[PDB]
Design a binder for this molecule. Structure first.
Ligand SMILES: CC(=O)N[C@@H]1[C@@H](O)[C@H](O[C@@H]2O[C@H](CO)[C@H](O)[C@H](O)[C@H]2O)[C@@H](CO)O[C@@H]1O
Ligand SMILES: CC(=O)N[C@@H]1[C@@H](O)[C@H](O[C@@H]2O[C@H](CO)[C@H](O)[C@H](O)[C@H]2O)[C@@H](CO)O[C@@H]1O
Lengths: 150, 150
């Protein structure tokens, strides 16, 4: 079950405030006003949420997903989208996904990994994010939410 | 727009794990499995979410609401439900709401106040919660989510 939803306004997105690269769209999310971060085009793709370990309970496996949609004009997804969870002790969950060829205009949830807080791992920033920093142009990915489940 | 939703599994609820007082129901919320915290009866009513100031951005007014529903059998809402936001620097937003006579079986969002992080208010726990500790029995309040908006 879902403990937190973090919408993209809570994240730090490189170029996120520059309308050449990113747009923001207000939509309803089951009675809540949310803003989708809608990627027009960017080369330095980087979206990071930061939540403190103290936000979570100990000795419980949490899994995180990012819910996204490819637009009809999506391109540049032949390069891997890197998925990362970084814990405050240094450990990273690292994985990747190649989005090229996936059906556009359908919401899908990308799992970005799992963590557990044990012992005196009580506090410190946890980073949840996705990035691709290659010189190619990523286009047409809309971001709905980070979900953290246990 | 909504930056975070925090579902009651992320909160600390006094007696929350005791089925004499509190039940948990699995439901779908916008394609996310969530568990409603459904108050059968309790005297020490206390629900607290704790999120770090570092989860939020500076120099922005956030407002917080708790979304709840009264059941057909709801009672003991003649006593005030205390609403609180506590910031890590000591400041508290305190308010209260008397729920007696509100329409049952309809979701409503209780505003619990607003905060802004300024200067080097960079970090530390923010508490969002509601409580009534009086010797009377509170019954039939179902809790959906904490919402933090800016
Ligand atoms: C619109 C676009 O994506 N521009 C990118 C630049 O951002 C990128 O330059 C890097 O940008 C990062 C942002 O954190 C740092 O400023 C880094 O020092 C820069 O090299 C360049 C080169 O990768 O590609 C586009 O111009
Ligand atoms: C089911 C129920 O509401 N029981 C309550 C007790 O919780 C309560 O005792 C207080 O409980 C709080 C819990 O944080 C502290 O332990 C406090 O020290 C206790 O006094 C009593 C008294 O208010 O009322 C019910 O029985």
């Amino acid at each position: 079950s879902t403990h937190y939803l973090a919408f993209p306004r809570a994240s730090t997105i490189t170029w996120g405030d520059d309308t050449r690269y990113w747009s923001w769209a207000t939509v309803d999310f089951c009675s809540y006003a949310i803003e989708e971060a809608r990627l027009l085009q960017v080369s330095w793709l980087d979206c990071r949420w930061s939540m403190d370990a103290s936000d979570f309970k100990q000795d419980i496996w949490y899994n995180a997903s990012v819910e996204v949609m490819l637009t009809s004009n999506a391109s540049g997804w032949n390069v891997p989208l890197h998925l990362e969870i970084e814990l405050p002790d240094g450990s990273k969950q690292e994985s990747q996904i190649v989005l090229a060829g996936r059906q556009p205009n359908v919401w899908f949830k990308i799992p970005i990994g799992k963590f557990i807080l044990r012992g005196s791992l009580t506090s410190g920033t946890i980073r949840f994010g996705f990035y691709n920093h290659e010189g190619n142009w990523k286009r047409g990915l809309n971001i709905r939410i980070l979900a953290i489940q246990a």
